[PDB]
């Protein structure tokens, strides 16, 4: 197991999850297969407690789980659950987690170009600039809104371009640290005496 | 494909060589996420830079070195100029003389304002394009032909 890969289960676990999803992974990434009932005592989680945790690893996938059956020492059958990390799976689904934050930060950058600019400060209601000339009325030579009868802004569309941006251009900044390990993790038996001689007499 | 991207959306290129980068008059690495931003405000903005577009001026590139983008870019403009074939010349210090003012003004202009340049190149262009210019894009697009074929 290359220590990237087990880097890149500890950067994505403790980035986006708690401490107690680190832990827990920890375990599987120090030890590749270790018992829930080890991790239980190990974490001192109670059962709800871990067993949530591991759904959670269980729905993204990450870790998974198998169970070995054995006899007791009194002769009662014990069922273990043997938890071990997918590394696979693991990279697979962040890779499908990322490119899916991907599209909705598409999304939302295309929202940030489809943003109405002209609005009314009396509904709150913000208008495409398409609606400019429904808007404008030329009997009060200005913008106006059809439902309030009142006067519709414009200049103040800068704000909701501009802020947008900053939002939506620190997540790449940020991820880094997660696309470069991706990037890094991409790949005797003789003749009896009656054959041997003459048996007729003579 | 190898490189990482526009300052902003850095990620798609890791992911597959069919995203390809586009250039600009202000030498800066564009693509439509960050394009689409460009037309809401400024309408042809440079997002760090501010030069403005006068259009879309848009054209797709596959190099990583924008210097080497500029100075395609310029060279093609500046090679309507001072392309004279070597007949023109009888020295041979002429075949070359005036390659190195013109490299030095398409190097120079990667980096430098166009002031004198285009002061330059539109005190030629008065003569040039008089003779001398009509006879080498006749010149120049045969030998292109003959380059092609
Ligand atoms: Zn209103
Ligand atoms: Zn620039
Ligand atoms: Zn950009």
């Known amino acids: 197991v290359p220590a990237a890969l ?55 996938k990450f870790i998974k789980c198998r169970m070995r059956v054995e006899t007791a020492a009194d002769g009662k059958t014990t069922r273990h659950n043997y938890y071990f990390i997918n590394y696979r799976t693991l990279v697979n689904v962040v890779k499908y987690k990322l490119d899916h934050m991907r599209r909705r930060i598409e999304t939302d950058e295309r929202d940030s170009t489809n943003r109405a600019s002209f609005k009314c400060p009396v509904c709150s209601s913000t208008f495409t600039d398409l609606e400019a000339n429904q808007l404008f009325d030329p009997m009060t030579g200005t913008f106006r809104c059809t439902f309030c009868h009142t006067e519709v802004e414009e200049d103040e569309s800068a704000m909701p371009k501009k802020d947008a941006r900053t939002l939506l251009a620190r997540f790449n900044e940020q991820i880094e640290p997660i696309y470069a390990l991706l990037r890094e993790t991409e790949d005797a038996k003789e003749r009896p005496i009656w054959l041997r001689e003459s048996t007729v007499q003579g | 494909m190898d490189d990482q991207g526009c ?18 008059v202000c030498g800066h690495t564009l693509c439509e996420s960050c394009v689409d931003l ?29 210097t080497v983008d500029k100075e395609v870019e310029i060279r093609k403009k500046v090679l ?11 020295s041979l210090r002429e075949y070359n003389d ?4 013109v490299e030095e003004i398409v190097f120079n202009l990667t980096n430098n304002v166009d002031l004198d340049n285009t002061k330059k190149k539109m005190e030629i262009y008065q003569k040039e394009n008089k003779d001398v210019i009509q006879k080498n894009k006749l010149k120049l697009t045969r030998e292109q032909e003959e380059l092609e074929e």
């Open chain 2, 38 to 66: 460009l037309f809401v405000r400024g309408a042809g903005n440079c997002p760090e830079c501010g030069t403005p577009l006068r259009k879309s001026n848009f054209r797709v590139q596959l190099f990583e070195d924008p």
């Open chain 1, 6 to 60: 087990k880097r890149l289960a500890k950067y994505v676990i403790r980035g986006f999850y708690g401490i107690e999803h680190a832990l827990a992974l920890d375990i599987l990434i120090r030890n590749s297969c270790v018992k829930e009932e080890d991790m239980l005592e190990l974490l001192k989680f109670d059962r709800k407690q871990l067993r949530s945790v591991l759904n959670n690893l269980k729905g993204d």
């Open chain 2, 7 to 24: 300052p902003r959306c850095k990620t798609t290129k890791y992911r597959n060589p069919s995203l390809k980068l586009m250039v600009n």
């Open chain 2, 80 to 90: 309507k100029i001072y392309n004279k074939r070597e007949e023109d010349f009888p």
């Open chain 2, 98 to 101: 005036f390659l190195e003012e």
